Amino acid sequence: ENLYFQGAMSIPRSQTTYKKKEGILTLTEDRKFLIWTPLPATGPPTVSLALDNITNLQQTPPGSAKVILKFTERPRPNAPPPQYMFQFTHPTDARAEANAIRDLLSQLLAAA
Ligand SMILES: [Cl-]
Ligand SMILES: [Cl-]
Numbered sequence: 001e002n003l004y005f006q007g008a009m010s011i012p013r014s015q016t017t018y019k020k021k022e023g024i025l026t027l028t029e030d031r032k033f034l035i036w037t038p039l040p041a042t043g044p045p046t047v048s049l050a051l052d053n054i055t056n057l058q059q060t061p062p063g064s065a066k067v068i069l070k071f072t073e074r075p076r077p078n079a080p081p082p083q084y085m086f087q088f089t090h091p092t093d094a095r096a097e098a099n100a101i102r103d104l105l106s107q108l109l110a111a112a
């Protein structure tokens, strides 16, 4: 009792499109940021979103035409809120990949 545990499995990396480009959606090793990087995934991420600034996560329902996760960010101190949609594109595993990254995130987000 009172033991606190953190996640210790491999961080999921998901084949996803963002603004119609293909790339990889993952978290940083410290599990503090959601990141998306365009293929070939040599470079830095195009999207880097602090878990601390995510205010919502939504999904297309299972059996939808597309598998999509939608992240809403805290409005920046520069003034509707920023949103990011990632379409899961693995031919067979799209929904399982979305579930996995969703399940990780919602665990990290609820713990804070
Ligand atoms: Cl589905
Ligand atoms: Cl599957």
Ligand SMILES: [Cs+]
Pocket (backbone or CB within 6 Å): 012, 013, 014, 015, 097
């Ligand atoms: Cs994977």
Ligand SMILES: [Cs+]
Pocket (backbone or CB within 6 Å): 051, 052, 053, 112
């Ligand atoms: Cs928060």
Ligand SMILES: [Cs+]
Pocket (backbone or CB within 6 Å): 063, 064, 065, 066, 067
């Ligand atoms: Cs689908």
Ligand SMILES: [Cs+]
Pocket (backbone or CB within 6 Å): 083, 084, 085
């Ligand atoms: Cs966006």
Ligand SMILES: [Cs+]
Pocket (backbone or CB within 6 Å): 015, 089, 090, 091
């Ligand atoms: Cs793909």
